[PDB]
Structure 1
Amino acid sequence: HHHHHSSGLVPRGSHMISKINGKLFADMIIQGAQNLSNNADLVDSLNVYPVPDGDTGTNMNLTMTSGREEVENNLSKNIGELGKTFSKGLLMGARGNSGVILSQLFRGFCKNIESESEINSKLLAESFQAGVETAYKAVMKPVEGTILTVAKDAAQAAIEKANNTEDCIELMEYIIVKANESLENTPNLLAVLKEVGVVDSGGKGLLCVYEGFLKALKGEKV
């Protein structure tokens, strides 16, 4: 096969994340929230399904902001506890189809890690997948080409990649690539999107959250 490795040296470098504690998850929430808020007017204008009522971005932003506010007032090193705080804030602030779905995605994500103090890349992936399950079960009649589709494709990318990727930065980068591909495909699933010439507004809002998650993993601010 290969050279048998036996070196006592430990690999170098700083730009990698092995474990996510409660303050890194808080930073992901905060930066995700801020990135969404900065894009809310755009996400509103994209809204066409089920009605073109100009509100997806507002709805998602208000929902996410409720979660963020609870987090910022109640930080913890324990990721499971921080997730309970985030979940509660989303669920007591969910607005619209998109904000309800967002709160259910993150309810299932957070429930999956409730007893953890920190998570690794595999459990980050598993938590995205748990959130997709929760959200699909919450919606009586799921429709494809939507925030659900983008979340599901993102979580299956996460599962696959995490199996051989310990770095949560590299994992989240891949999740975003694959979530973007799914978002760009939404008009091929939901007719009104292709007729109007837009991607799904809920899916776009979710991408905005994920992009902020990556900024936080890199130790950066939106």
Structure 2
Amino acid sequence: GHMAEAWGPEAVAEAFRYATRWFQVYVEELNALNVYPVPDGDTGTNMLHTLEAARRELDLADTSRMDQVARALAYGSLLGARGNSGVILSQILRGFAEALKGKRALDGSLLRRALRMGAESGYKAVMRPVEGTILTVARAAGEGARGEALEEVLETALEAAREALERTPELLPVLRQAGVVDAGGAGYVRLLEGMRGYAL
């Protein structure tokens, strides 16, 4: 039977495929926001290449098993990771995959755990983390994910992420001086937005 408020392994794979297709519209905007640590206009391109490599790996895997979906997500994202945002994103996805290992379906409760473990894995991966960044936005999303149904969890996680994103120039002066929010954190918002679109 269908679980209504839970994704099977095939649906989890489709969610990330959907989110990848969603992401491409926002690439040019993310590039133009990129001021930290250097303004070289590539955050959107870097994050998209990371996502696209995860999708290529999922297409080669047996997405009927949750442990194979998790393996493809971590392994693909690492190889395709580009730049600081891509490396961090790949390690966020590795923590997300870790929460999926040993589980048969992704429900609201596991999605909270996955978002929280993703943020911690991304934080541990950076040698010297800085706040006002993708790390701050990813952590807020996991902390603010509430509810039992997927849709409520994604909605509350997204709202907490958008709220943290607006506060990034308050924490990082280079963002305030340039009048932008963090490009990496904005990319993570767009990724959560795509996931909500799949679940809606």
Which structure 1 segments of 5+ residues have no match?
A: 1-13
1:114 to 101, 108, 123: 101
> What does residue 28 of structure 2 align with?
41
Whether 1:135 aligns to 2:122 is yes
Aligned partner of 2:73 in structure 1 is 86
5+ residue gaps, structure 2: none
Report the CA distance between 1:169 and its aligned residue: 0.9
Structure 2 CA distance for partners of 1:66 and 1:185, relative to 1, 3 Å:
same
RMSD: 1.5
- 1:197 equivalent to 2:179? Answer yes
Say how many residue pairs are matched: 199
Between the aligned partners of 1:20 and 1:139, the Cα distance in structure 2 is 30
Higher-Rg structure is: 1
TM-score (normalised: structure 1): 0.86
Q: What is the aligned partner in structure 2 of residue 98 from structure 1?
A: 85
Q: Could you say which structure has the greater relative contact order, defined with CA pairs below 8 angstroms and 6 or more residues apart?
A: 1
1:185 aligns with 2:172: no
> Which whole-Å CA distance do the structure 2 matches of 1:50 and 1:191 have between them?
12
Q: Match of 1:195, as an amino acid?
A: Q
Alpha-carbon offset, residue 92 of structure 1 = 1.1
Counterpart position of 1:213 = 195
TM-superposed CA distance for 1:217, in Å, is 1.2
Q: Report whether the alignment pairs 1:173 with 2:155.
A: yes
Percent of pairs with identical residues:
40
Classify the secondary structure of the residue corresponding to 2:106: coil
Say which SS state the counterpart of residue 80 (structure 2) adopts. coil
1:147 and 2:129 equivalent?
Answer: no
* Offset of residue 81 of structure 1: 1.9
1:217 & 1:44 partners in 2: Cα distance?
A: 27
Secondary structure, aligned partner of 2:6 = coil
1:43-58 counterparts in 2 under 5 A? Answer: 43-58=30-45
> Is the 8 Å Cα contact of residues 26 and 75 (structure 1) preserved in structure 2?
no
Please tell me whether the aligned partners of residues 176 and 211 of structure 1 are also in contact (alpha carbons under 8 angstroms). Answer: yes
How far has the Cα of 1:78 moved from its partner? 2.6
Distance 2:25 2:57 in 1: 20
* More helix, by proportion: 2
Q: Does the C-alpha gap of structure 1 residues 208 and 149 become closer, same or farther in structure 2, counting only changes over 3 Å?
A: same
Query: Using a 3 Å threshold, how does the CA distance of structure 1 residues 17 and 194 change in structure 2: closer, same or farther?
Result: farther
Residue of structure 2 equivalent to 1:123 = 110
